[PDB]
């Protein structure tokens, strides 16, 4: 068989810069047996380049490939925010079937952006089941690093919440975080003020969005 | 006392492509089995249905000498009961094949520094090849629903490709010259005897 | 109009069987190299099987003796029968047409998820998230379901811009929980109606829920 | 090369039975299949050549059939001098002659649960820097048995070897000895040493243990 | 009535050479093809080489290609096998087999008794015998013959007086290249305090005989 090894593993560049994704095979194969694939989150991979250097149909000019033997390269000039994806190289010289690469993750940098904090109380349709889920939303921010502190009557809640971050957006290249605070219906009425502290690089001071039960 | 023309097949300066494999019909001759009698280790030698030490003691009606060129990773397919692009679409051997296969690395002969695209192979075919079938058709292969009409386009591709033998490639991508000797014994006078 | 529509994934117990389909349009399966590629959650791509136009089949060493690739020319559909499934076989399975030297693997299926587990399929529970007091935000909460995935859209896919569907989290109760939100202008609140479309193929549960302020 | 598969790897039968051994080839080998018998410690003897032709001197109770990929050796009436291993060998690829895995025709008898014994390493051997713990399975049937080593209720792996005896000439049973080898240092660092035997004749896995220094 | 008798097998270090012979009797030797087939300890059969009736044709398996050389002397009715560059995997019993000759293909109708060829870089070493003491209706006790080279060893009990219930196990090849086996015997628990059990271990290669007395601890 043939083993494929890519490098680097993660590549974070600003929009407009030049990317260089490496790929090498265990055996010296022909340049016509290599291919590059782009896989954006939640999608199937799409062909970018086959035969190391020939561009597929409908692929922009900025995607170009080169190399032969055991030194193949994928160059992404004029990096755009929609290029956030994992890029795989494959080889179909060890027929039948092909062998994929480990994959190069390409993150995209940008300017700092403050998150928009919303807080959602639990629905009435949910309180009848015995559980009460308070939801806090951090929308469109950068970088990824953002701390969420749940304050219930100004008491920090540990071991009671679960966060969730999205992939980089294809247009603005920001993230979005959803912290969920699940606690029983009986314990939901033992307390009164449900807050959500948000600390971020794009905030000169921690921002808190709260509400009162029954208002 | 004619001698079977085996030198013309092994010592040939140029070999055929696998899709248009050449066959030399050898009959009515005395077989000097020596090109295959003592072969060096660097020769792939596999016989099927018949023993080599017994070939000198057998007479056949006709002996067919098929010669062509593939890459190293594809020699394993030149055998009875094998599947793959070469076996299915270029040169197929039957399940009851009676004969030997000979293959040697010819990287010093058929590989140029700038690539030897002269040797070809068939990539697309609508069905599999029958045993000892030779298809030299170059009609645009239809891979979609719309008819090609001799147009290279989407789902309409040329059915032949080049090997591009460069000496700096791995052993599995280096050219191997293959000689398949078929030994036929039908209701006919046996004329290819040994000595 | 070149599509590769897959179907038939879902939850299957270890050691059971499951058969995937790959309906083809404008591409003829019987006249092409068709392959099955799988991708484990959070890992790379693995080629599983291939079938030639002549009928030759080949399988990777990791699915040999357990998978069987087939096709039906009358339906123009590629198939993959999977037997003796285990934990490693959990992945998103893709079908795709192979062009080898003359185009690589251009067209791919959308991919169906195969979850091999010994757990029951529980339907989700969709709860609204009403907006409170520049712009406003609202969404749905898809709580307590198994297994992955759940597809959530707004207005039957008519509302694309501004929607953030969050990845599911594995809560302690073994089930999942998923949040989907969308920021909309505060003006078109009473005139524009918002409905989230939650689908759970493993449990066959489709729920449309209205979201409106208190 | 061509792979020959023999099923079963071992079968139990008594005198007078009709025994049939199967042999599969990965590809069609026409009629060029051969059957060989081999007693323990003796040379192999030819029984059937060319799928069905009986070799001179071989009794008429042996016979062969089949062509292509499936082949069958048949003993019409099993005799005491017929308990041996039988190999099938293909000769289609004359320059790549390959044999099968062989089928061992054993003497069938009633199920017999093993007598489990465990021996701590001698004080003499411990003075040399090595500890050898031996687990004995005495006079059981059939040969199938699982032997797991546990050190302080922790399963061992990769430090033990087994040895099985031929069928006993008097009760047709087997005996197995498993040797766990530890350094003297690793032996002194633990207390409870046990081997767990799983057999058909046992209702539950039987564990024989000892405590170091007791 | 066809006889094939091998010789030349022994113990050989890796990378060294060894030559085998095979004396043929009671058949026209110079008109049949001849084969060599080896079998590893506990494994199946593996075809090695073939030489034509006149010795002008030689063919070898891919695992012994360019490493072994087969020849024959039809004036002495002997088949040879020159084995150079021996590896540990070449450790096997080597049989010489006569080709049946009736078929267009090869098949072996008569074999020799076989000669053993062991390849290892371990020198001759005598065995150390350690007792297997019985547990403090029937009890079990034995001896552990550990770390010897090469095979075989012979174990008796009470100088041969005790043969019932005795199971001498096949030697296993440890990771150190040295063999080791165990010999056990089952006896009534009443005789443990009234009978002396002595195992007699004998290893002719190193000329080492060890009598060990097994007593309860």
**Which residues of chain D have a CB within 8 Å of the CB of E180?**
179
E215: nearest CA partner in chain D: D122
Measure B67 CA to nearest chain C CA, in Å.
Answer: 24
- Shared domain for A92 and A122, answered yes or no, is no
- Shared domain for A99 and A75, answered yes or no, is yes
User: Which of A90, A98, A137 lies nearest to residue C181, judging by beta carbons?
Assistant: A137
- Shared domain for E108 and E161, answered yes or no, is no
User: CA D176 to CA E105: how far, in whole Å?
Assistant: 42
E35: nearest CA partner in chain B: B53
Nearest to B65 by CA among B96, B38, B27: B27
Q: Between chains, do E95 and D44 touch, taking CB under 8 Å as contact?
A: yes
Q: Between chains, do D27 and B95 touch, taking CB under 8 Å as contact?
A: yes
Q: What is chain A written as a DSSP string?
A: ---EEEE-SEEEE-TT--EEEEEEESS-B-GGGEEEEEE-TTS--EEEEETTTEEPTT--TTEEEEEEBTEEEEEE-S--GGG-EEEEEEE-SSSSS-EE---EEEEE----B--EEEEEPPPHHHHTTTEEEEEEEEEEEBSS-EEEEEEESS-B--SSEE--BPPPPSSS--EEEEEEEEEEHHHHSS--EEEEEEEETT-SS-EE--EES--
- Shared domain for C46 and C137, answered yes or no, is no
3-class state of residue D113 by DSSP:
coil
* Residues A48 and A111: beta-carbon distance below 8 Å: no
What six digits make up the tokens of A19? 């990317």
User: CA B172 to CA A89: how far, in whole Å?
Assistant: 20
D49: nearest CA partner in chain E: E107
Query: Last residue of a domain, which of D78, D107, D136?
Result: D107
Q: Between chains, do E104 and B53 touch, taking CB under 8 Å as contact?
A: no
User: CA D23 to CA D102: how far, in whole Å?
Assistant: 9
Give strand pairing partners of A132: A183
D132 burial level (CB within 10 Å; 0-12, 13-18, 19+): buried
User: CA C151 to CA A1: how far, in whole Å?
Assistant: 38
Alpha helices (runs of H) in C64-135, residue ranges in sequence order: none
The CATH number of whichever domain residue D128 belongs to comes to 2.60.40.10
- Shared domain for A123 and A100, answered yes or no, is no
Which chains border D (3 or more CB–CB pairs < 8 Å)?
A: B, E
Distance set, CA B88 to CA B91, C57, C101 (Å) = 7, 12, 18
* Residue whose entry in the numeric block shows the structure tokens 């398996």: E61
Measure B124 CA to nearest chain C CA, in Å.
Answer: 8
A205 burial level (CB within 10 Å; 0-12, 13-18, 19+): exposed
Q: Give residues 179 to 208 of E whose Cβ lies within 8 Å of D.
A: 180-182, 184, 186
**Which residues of chain D have a CB within 8 Å of the CB of E38?**
none
- Shared domain for D65 and D11, answered yes or no, is yes
C48 burial level (CB within 10 Å; 0-12, 13-18, 19+): buried
**Which region, left, alpha or beta, applies to residue C103 given φ > 0 means left and ψ of -120 to 50 means alpha?**
left
User: After which residues do gaps appear in chain E, with C to N over 2.5 Å?
Assistant: 136
Inter-residue long-range contacts of A56-62, CB under 8 Å, 24+ positions, other chains counted: A56/C103, A56/C104, A56/C106, A57/B154, A57/C106
User: For residue D202, what are the domain limits?
Assistant: 115-211
Please report, in angstroms and rounded to a whole number, the separation of the first and last CA atoms in chain D: 57
User: For residue E173, what are the domain limits?
Assistant: 128-214
Query: Last residue of a domain, which of C88, C116, C144?
Result: C116
Q: Between chains, do C28 and B124 touch, taking CB under 8 Å as contact?
A: no
* Residue whose entry in the numeric block shows the structure tokens 């165990």: E182
User: CA C140 to CA C44: how far, in whole Å?
Assistant: 32
Q: What is B139-182 written as a DSSP string?
A: PPEE-BSS--SS--BTTEE-SEEE--B-TTS-GGGSEEEEEEEE
User: CA A72 to CA E107: how far, in whole Å?
Assistant: 52
Query: Last residue of a domain, which of A74, A108, A142?
Result: A108
- Shared domain for A100 and A149, answered yes or no, is no
- Shared domain for E159 and E99, answered yes or no, is no
Resolution in angstroms comes to: 3.2
* Residues B165 and B41: beta-carbon distance below 8 Å: no
**Which residues of chain A have a CB within 8 Å of the CB of C141?**
120, 123, 126, 133, 135, 180
Alpha helices (runs of H) in chain B, residue ranges in sequence order: 7-10, 85-89
* Residues C177 and C169: beta-carbon distance below 8 Å: yes
Q: Does C109 touch chain A (CB under 8 A)?
A: yes
- Shared domain for C107 and C129, answered yes or no, is no
- Shared domain for A103 and A133, answered yes or no, is no
Judged by 3 or more CB pairs under 8 A, whether C touches E is no
User: Which of C54, C102, C103 lies nearest to residue B127, judging by beta carbons?
Assistant: C54
Distance set, CA C148 to CA A92, A168, C115, C142, C177 (Å) = 32, 22, 8, 12, 10
- In sequence order, the 6+-apart residues with CB closer than 8 A to the CB of E38 are E45, E46, E48, E90, E92, E93, E94, E95, E117
Q: What is D32-96 written as a DSSP string?
A: -EEEEEE-TTS-EEEEEETTTEEPTTS-TTEEEE--TTEEEEEESS--GGG-SEEEEEE-SBTTS
- Shared domain for A102 and A127, answered yes or no, is no
Strands lying side by side in the sheet with A161-162: A116-120, A131-141, A175-184, A161-162
What six digits make up the tokens of A24? 């090498």
User: CA A16 to CA D72: how far, in whole Å?
Assistant: 72
User: Which of C26, C28, C56 lies nearest to residue B88, judging by beta carbons?
Assistant: C56
Strands D10-13 and D103-107: parallel
Q: Between chains, do C27 and B84 touch, taking CB under 8 Å as contact?
A: no
Q: Between chains, do B144 and C99 touch, taking CB under 8 Å as contact?
A: no
Angle at E155 between CA E154 and CA E160, to 5 degrees: 115
User: CA A145 to CA A165: how far, in whole Å?
Assistant: 10
User: CA E77 to CA E70: how far, in whole Å?
Assistant: 14
User: CA A160 to CA E93: how far, in whole Å?
Assistant: 70
- In sequence order, the 6+-apart residues with CB closer than 8 A to the CB of D123 are none
Q: Which helix (H) or strand (E) holds D185?
A: helix D184-188
- Shared domain for D27 and D91, answered yes or no, is yes
Query: Last residue of a domain, which of A108, A127, A158?
Result: A108
User: CA E183 to CA E130: how far, in whole Å?
Assistant: 11
* Number of domains chain D is built from: 2
3-class state of residue B9 by DSSP:
helix
- Shared domain for A102 and A124, answered yes or no, is no
* Residues A161 and A150: beta-carbon distance below 8 Å: yes
* Residues C8 and C21: beta-carbon distance below 8 Å: yes
E137: nearest CA partner in chain D: D115
Nearest to C154 by CA among C198, C190, C213: C198
Give strand pairing partners of A23: A6, A72
Q: Does C23 touch chain A (CB under 8 A)?
A: no
- Shared domain for A31 and A103, answered yes or no, is yes
User: CA E79 to CA E58: how far, in whole Å?
Assistant: 12
Inter-residue long-range contacts of E169-174, CB under 8 Å, 24+ positions, other chains counted: E169/D163, E169/D164, E169/D165, E169/D175, E169/D176, E169/D177, E170/D163, E170/D164, E170/D165, E171/D163, E171/E145, E172/D161, E172/D162, E172/D163, E172/D179, E174/D161, E174/D181, E174/E147
User: CA E210 to CA E208: how far, in whole Å?
Assistant: 7
Q: Give residues 69 to 108 of C whose Cβ lies within 8 Å of A.
A: 94, 96, 98-106, 108
HSE, CB side, 13 Å, CA atoms: give it for residue B95. Answer: 10
User: CA E75 to CA A145: how far, in whole Å?
Assistant: 90
- Shared domain for C82 and C156, answered yes or no, is no
Measure C73 CA to nearest chain B CA, in Å.
Answer: 13
* Residues A35 and A44: beta-carbon distance below 8 Å: no
Nearest to B163 by CA among B104, B112, B103: B112
- Shared domain for D88 and D120, answered yes or no, is no
């Amino acid at each position: 068989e043939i083993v494929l090894t890519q490098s680097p593993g993660t590549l974070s560049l600003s929009p407009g810069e030049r990317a260089t994704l490496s790929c090498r095979a265990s055996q010296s194969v022909s340049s016509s047996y290599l291919a590059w694939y782009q896989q954006k989150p939640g999608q199937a991979p799409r062909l970018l380049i086959y035969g190391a250097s020939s561009r597929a149909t409908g692929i922009p000019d900025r995607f170009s490939g080169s190399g032969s033997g055991t030194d193949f390269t994928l160059t992404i000039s004029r990096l755009e925010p929609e290029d956030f994806a994992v890029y795989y190289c494959q080889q179909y010289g060890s027929s039948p079937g092909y062998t994929f690469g480990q994959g190069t993750k390409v993150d995209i940098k940008r300017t700092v952006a403050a998150p928009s904090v919303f807080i959602f109380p639990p629905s009435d349709e949910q309180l009848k089941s015995g559980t009460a889920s308070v939801v806090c939303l951090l929308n469109n921010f950068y970088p990824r690093e953002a701390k969420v502190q749940w304050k219930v009557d100004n008491a920090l809640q540990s071991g009671n919440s679960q966060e969730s971050v999205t992939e980089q957006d294809s247009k603005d290249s920001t993230y979005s975080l959803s912290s969920t605070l699940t606690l029983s219906k009986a314990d939901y009425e033992k307390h009164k003020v449900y807050a959500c502290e948000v600390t971020h690089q794009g905030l000169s001071s921690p921002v808190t969005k709260s509400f009162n039960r029954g208002e | 006392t004619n001698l079977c023309p085996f030198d013309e097949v092994f010592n040939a300066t140029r070999f055929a492509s696998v899709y248009a494999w050449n066959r030399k019909r050898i009959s009515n001759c005395v077989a000097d089995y020596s090109v295959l009698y003592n072969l060096a280790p660097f020769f792939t030698f596999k016989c099927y249905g018949v023993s080599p030490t017994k070939l000198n003691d057998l007479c056949f009606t006709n002996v067919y000498a098929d010669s062509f060129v593939i890459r190293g990773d594809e020699v394993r397919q030149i055998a009875p009961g094998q599947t793959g692009n070469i076996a299915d679409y270029n040169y197929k051997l039957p399940d009851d094949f009676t004969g030997c296969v000979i293959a040697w690395n010819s990287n010093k002969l058929d590989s140029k520094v700038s690539g030897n695209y002269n040797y070809l192979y068939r990539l697309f075919r609508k069905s599999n090849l029958k045993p000892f079938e030779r298809d030299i058709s170059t009609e645009i292969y239809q891979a979609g629903n719309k008819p090609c009409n001799g147009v290279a386009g989407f789902n309409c591709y040329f059915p032949l490709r080049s090997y591009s033998f460069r000496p700096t490639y791995g052993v599995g991508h280096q050219p191997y010259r293959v000689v398949v000797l078929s030994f036929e014994l039908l209701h006919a006078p046996a004329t290819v005897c040994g000595k | 109009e070149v599509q590769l529509v897959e179907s038939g994934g879902g939850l299957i117990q270890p050691g059971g069987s499951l058969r995937l389909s790959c309906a083809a349009s404008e591409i003829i399966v019987s006249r092409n190299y068709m392959s099955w590629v799988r991708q484990a959650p959070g890992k790379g791509l693995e080629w599983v099987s291939v079938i030639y136009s002549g009928g030759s089949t080949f399988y990777a060493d990791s699915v040999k003796g357990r998978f069987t690739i087939s096709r039906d020319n009358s339906k123009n559909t590629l198939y993959l029968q999977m037997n003796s499934l285990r934990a490693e076989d959990t992945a998103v399975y893709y079908c795709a047409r192979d062009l080898d030297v003359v185009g690589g693997t251009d067209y791919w299926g959308q991919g169906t998820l195969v979850t091999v587990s010994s757990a029951s399929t529980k339907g989700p529970s969709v709860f609204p998230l009403a907006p409170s007091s520049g712009t406003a935000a609202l969404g749905c909460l898809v709580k307590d379901y198994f297994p992955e995935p759940v597809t959530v859209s707004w207005n039957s896919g008519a509302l694309t811009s501004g929607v953030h569907t969050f990845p599911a989290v594995l809560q302690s109760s073994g089930l999942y929980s998923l949040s989907s939100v969308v920021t909309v202008p505060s003006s078109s609140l009473g005139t524009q109606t918002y409905i989230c479309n939650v689908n759970h193929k493993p449990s066959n549960t489709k729920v449309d829920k209205r979201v409106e302020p208190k």
